Write a protein that binds this ligand. Structure first.
Ligand SMILES: Cc1cc(-c2ccc(/N=N/c3ccc4c(S(=O)(=O)O)cc(S(=O)(=O)O)c(N)c4c3O)c(C)c2)ccc1/N=N\c1ccc2c(S(=O)(=O)O)cc(S(=O)(=O)O)c(N)c2c1O
Lengths: 274, 274, 274
C-alpha cells in the first residue's frame, strides 16, 4: 500500500491543485466585474471659460457684470445698464418632444479662479399669473468650442441630452459654486461633468421702497476651488499575472511533491532500518 | 577554509527570505484592515414605488396630484380638491422616547422615471403661535411591502431608526429629487439608502391677495435619474494566493541557491586552475 | 535543422520573457500615478467640542443656547437674554489681502451627539443699505485647542487658508448639520474637514408685528450622524524594482523548460525510432 501512500500524497497535491484552480478562476470572474475606482485631484491655473445657458423665457436681462472681486458692489434695482459680457441667442429643438423650440441665452463664464472672478446677473420679469417664478439654467465645459463648432443646435442638443439642468429661484439672489469632475470609460473618453452647491441669500425690498411689486432674480456664478476631480474606474484583473501565478503554483506543487518524494525516500530508508 | 565563502551567499539568501516573510505578513495584516471601495451603476426602466412619510400633525391635505409632465400646470391658491393619491394613516410609539406618538400618513411615490412622473401635493395650516413652520418626512424603499407586511408599527420603527428624517419648509415650493444607493454587508444583506438634493423656489403672495396669514405648503417629489448606485466593499489579498506566493518565492529562492551553488562549484574549479 | 527546432522552445521562451518584462514594467510604472482610494466609518460615542466662528460685523448677538431636546423652545424675539455660551472675541487680519482686519466671534459647538445637542443662535441687525444681508461662518476642529495654543492669530490664519467658508442668509433660519471627514496624506499627516447640508425654514413676522422691520437671523447647529468618515489613498505593490517576482517566475519557467526539453530528448529518441 506504500505505493498507494505515495499516490495518496499525489492525490492530496491534486486536490490542492483543483481547489487552487477553482478558487483562482472564480476570483478572476469576480475581479473582471466589480472594478474598484480611484480619485485624483489636479490643480488648474485658470479654468477654461465655461458656458452658462439660461432660459429666461419672458424675462429680460438687466445687467451682467464680470466682477473680479469676491465681494460684488452695490446694485440699483430695476436700473438697466452695466452690460460687459458676451451673449448669444439660440433656438434649438429639445429632443424630449421635438415640438417645443426652447430659446436659450448662452453666456460666457469666469476663468480666473485665483482672483475670485465671478459673474453677476440681474433679471426682471413682469408680474403674471404663473404663481411660481423660476429660471432653469445649464452648464457646459467650454464656450469657445460652442461658438466655433458649426451646427450649434447640435452641440446644445447633445449637451441637453447628456447633462442635467437645475433651476434657480426668484425673489432672492442665488450663489452658485461650480466644480468639474472628469471620468474615463472603457472607450477612453474624458467625459466632463459639473457639480454645484447652492447658497441662497435673501433680497431686501427696503431699497426699492416702491409699489411696483415686480419680481427680480439675481444670480452669482463662481468657481468653488481650483481643484478638478478625476475618477477612474480602475481594473485590477490582469490575465497574464494570474496565469503566471497559476503556473508557478502548479510547479511549486510539483516541486514540493519532489521534496516530499525525497523525504519519502528517507522514510523508505527508515523502513529498511526497521 | 572556503566553506564559509560558499555559505556567505546562503546566509544572505536566508536574510532575504526572512525579509520577504516579514514584508508579506505585514502587507497582509495591513490589507485585512483597509478594505477598498467600488461603485457600480445601472439603467433601470421603472423604479419601485418609493415610500413617503409626511408628518403633518396639525395640517390637513388639500391636493395631491400624480402628474406625468415635467412641468406641473397652473394651480389655484387654497381651494382643496383633486385627491388622486393613495394614503394610509398609521400611529406608532416613537422608537426614541416611548413617550410621544407621532401620527403619520404614507403616500405612494412616483414610479416611472422615464415618463418623469412627479407627485405634487400642497398643505395649509391656519395661523398659529409657532412662529416657525416646517414639516418632516422620510422615505423608504417600497410602499407595497409595508402595505402587505403585518405588524406595521415594527416596520415603521425600523424605517425611522434607519432612514434619515428630512424636513421641508412652509411658505414656498421645495422641488425634491430622489436617488437610491445600495450597499452589501459582510453578511450579505442589501441595505438601501435614500439621498436627494432639494431645490427651493419662492411663492408669491399676489395670488392669495387676501388677509388670511395662512401657510400654504408645496412639495414636489420626483425621481432624479434612471441610475441606482451600488457601493461594494471589496476585500483584497485573499489568503490562499498569498500563501502560494510565499511558497513559490521560497522554492524559487532555493532553486536559485542551488543554481548559484553549481556555478560556485564551477568557479571553484576555476580557482583550482589558479 | 533539428538543433534549432530543439531550441525553438527557447525562442518562444525569449518572446514570452520579453512580453512579460514589458508588461510588468509598464503596469507597475502606471500603478504609481493613480493609487486606489479606500473609505471607512468610525462610530464615536461623543464628539470633541468644535469651534464655530462667525463674522457678524455690525450685527450683535441676542441669545446663544444649548438645547439637548430635539425641539427647540419658542420665545418672543427682540429681547436679549438667556446667554449660556462661551465666546472669545478676536481681531485678526485676513491672508487674502492683508489689508482688511475682520473681527470674529467664536462659540463652542455641540458635543453630545447622542443626547441630541443643538446650538441655537439669534442675531439682530438694523436695517441698512446693504440690500443683501448674509453672515459667513467657519468651523474648526476644537475650540479648546484654540484657547490653549498661543499665537492664536496664526491658528485662525491657517484655518481660514485651509477650510472653506459658506454663509447663511438673513430673514429665515438655517438648520446646519455637521460631519467630519479625515484624510491622511502621504507625508504622515492627518487632515480633518467639515461637511454640511443646510436646510432653511421660513421665519414668520407675526411675532414682531411692528413697523421696525429689523432683520433677525436664526441659526441651529447639529451633528448629522455620529460617524466619522475616513478616506485614504493606498498603493498596490511598493517594491520599486519587484525583481524577486519576475526573477522567481523566470527561474520556475526555465526549470519547466529544462524538464520539457528532457521530454523532448525522449522525443529525440522517438525520432531515432523514426
Ligand atoms: C520586496 C517587496 C515585495 C512587494 C510585493 C511583491 C509582490 C506582491 N504580490 N504579488 C505577486 C504576484 C506574482 C508573483 C509571481 S508570478 O505569478 O509568476 O508573476 C512570482 C513571484 S516569485 O516566485 O518570484 O517570488 C511572486 N513573488 C509574485 C508576487 O509576489 C505584493 C503584494 C507585494 C512589495 C514591496 C516590496 N519591497 N518594498 C520595499 C523594499 C525596500 C525598501 C527600502 S530598502 O532600503 O531597500 O530597505 C526603502 C524604502 S524607502 O526609502 O521608501 O523608505 C522602501 N519604500 C522600500 C520598499 O518599499
Amino acid at each position: 500500500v506504500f505505493s498507494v501512500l505515495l499516490i495518496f500524497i499525489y492525490l492530496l497535491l491534486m486536490a490542492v491543485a483543483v481547489f487552487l484552480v477553482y478558487r483562482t478562476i472564480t476570483d478572476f470572474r469576480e475581479k473582471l466585474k466589480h472594478p474598484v475606482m480611484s480619485v485624483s485631484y489636479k490643480e488648474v491655473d485658470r479654468y477654461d471659460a465655461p458656458g452658462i445657458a439660461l432660459y429666461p423665457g419672458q424675462a429680460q436681462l438687466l445687467s451682467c457684470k464680470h466682477h473680479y472681486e469676491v465681494i460684488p458692489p452695490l446694485t440699483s434695482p430695476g436700473q438697466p445698464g452695466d452690460m460687459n459680457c458676451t451673449t448669444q441667442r439660440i433656438n434649438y429643438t429639445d429632443p424630449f418632444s421635438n415640438q417645443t423650440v426652447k430659446s436659450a441665452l448662452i453666456v460666457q463664464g469666469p476663468r480666473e479662479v485665483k482672483k475670485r472672478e465671478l459673474v453677476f446677473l440681474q433679471f426682471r420679469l413682469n408680474k403674471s399669473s404663473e404663481d411660481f417664478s423660476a429660471i432653469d439654467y445649464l452648464l457646459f465645459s467650454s464656450f469657445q468650442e460652442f461658438l466655433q463648432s458649426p451646427n450649434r443646435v447640435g452641440f446644445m442638443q447633445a449637451c441637453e441630452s447628456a447633462y442635467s439642468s437645475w433651476k434657480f429661484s426668484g425673489g432672492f439672489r442665488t450663489w452658485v459654486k461650480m466644480s468639474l469632475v472628469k471620468t474615463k470609460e472603457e472607450d477612453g473618453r474624458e467625459a466632463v461633468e459639473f457639480r454645484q452647491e447652492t447658497s441662497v441669500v435673501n433680497y431686501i425690498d427696503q431699497r426699492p421702497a416702491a409699489k411696483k411689486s415686480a419680481q427680480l432674480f439675481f444670480v452669482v456664478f463662481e468657481w468653488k476651488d481650483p481643484f478638478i476631480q478625476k475618477v477612474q474606474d480602475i481594473v485590477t484583473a490582469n490575465p497574464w499575472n494570474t496565469i503566471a501565478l497559476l503556473c508557478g503554483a502548479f510547479l511549486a506543487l510539483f516541486k514540493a511533491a519532489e521534496f516530499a518524494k525525497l523525504s519519502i525516500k528517507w522514510m523508505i530508508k527508515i523502513r529498511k532500518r526497521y
